[PDB]
Design a binder for this molecule. Structure first.
Ligand SMILES: C[C@@H](O)[C@@H](C(=O)O)[C@H]1C[C@H](SCCNC=N)C(C(=O)O)=N1
Ligand SMILES: C[C@@H](O)[C@@H](C(=O)O)[C@H]1C[C@H](SCCNC=N)C(C(=O)O)=N1
Ligand SMILES: [Cl-]
Length: 244
């Protein structure tokens, strides 16, 4: 581990949007990491919907989710996010960060197996204190941007302690963007229930000959700025010549 190079010039991308945050990048081929803020890079927050990555893996490996086509019917309760008020499969539940679908996963996984799996994953502080169906939103689990990278690297290489199939399905469900230059597999998150409210974007960029892992979070006082998670990350990615 060569350490983490700090590149403060990326702060310009946050300041441009009156925002504060961190982007962490990991060059897989060179085993080199870069961040604008070495301190915040290692600060552990609630994972919020980025927890849908480990939650999906566990649900799949325990057969709570059979495959990416299985339909989880809307419970008929109207919630404030319109896309949640419909039937979902794993693909669309990830895409739209459909919390109630994953809360039901968590309840079926159960506290004991959830704890053991997060320890097996070496995920964050491995603490699931709180409600079994909400701890990643308002309980004890905390993970930093650099810890997200470590976890994502295991998933990329199929090294997590679940089946290869489970890891392949989750990486399929993380698909976010692709073109002839790059593929982004990622997961957003918006931690709102405990201060400070922060937005997440974690994942990686696949190139022909390299993979660049990333994890960012940023202060997010309102949902108004949620698009800045991807916008700021892409500005860093383009400055670093990762995407055109
Ligand atoms: C061809 C078969 O062997 C193959 C299949 O699905 O048909 C099995 C082999 C491993 S088993 C789970 C990981 N092993 C852990 N010790 C695997 C998987 O990890 O998805 N599937
Ligand atoms: C509030 C939490 O449930 C939060 C999370 O679990 O991380 C939800 C809300 C937004 S998706 C809809 C956008 N929300 C407000 N505009 C979000 C995400 O950005 O991933 N997941
Ligand atoms: Cl894919």
């Amino acid at each position: 581990f060569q350490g983490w190079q700090e590149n403060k010039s990326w702060n310009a991308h946050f300041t441009e949007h009156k925002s504060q945050g961190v982007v962490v990048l990991w060059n897989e081929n060179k085993q080199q990491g870069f961040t604008n803020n070495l301190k915040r890079a290692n600060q552990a927050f609630l994972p919020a919907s980025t927890f849908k990555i480990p939650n999906s893996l566990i649900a799949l490996d325990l057969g709570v989710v059979k495959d990416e086509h299985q339909v989880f019917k809307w419970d008929g309760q109207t919630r404030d996010i319109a896309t949640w008020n419909r039937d979902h499969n794993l693909i669309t539940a990830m895409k739209y960060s459909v919390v109630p679908v994953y809360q039901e996963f968590a309840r079926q996984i159960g506290e004991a197996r959830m704890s053991k799996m997060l320890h097996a994953f070496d995920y964050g502080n491995e603490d699931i204190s709180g409600n079994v169906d909400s701890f990643w939103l308002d309980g004890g689990i905390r993970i930093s941007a650099t810890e997200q990278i470590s976890f994502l690297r295991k998933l990329y290489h199929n090294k997590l302690h679940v089946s290869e199939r489970s890891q392949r399905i989750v990486k399929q469900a993380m698909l976010t963007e692709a073109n002839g230059d790059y593929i982004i597999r990622a997961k957003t998150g918006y931690s709102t229930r405990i201060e400070p409210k922060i937005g997440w974007w974690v994942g990686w960029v696949e190139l022909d000959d390299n993979v660049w892992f990333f994890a960012m979070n940023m202060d997010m006082p309102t949902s108004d700025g949620l698009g800045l998670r991807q916008a700021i990350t892409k500005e860093v990615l383009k400055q670093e010549k990762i995407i055109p």
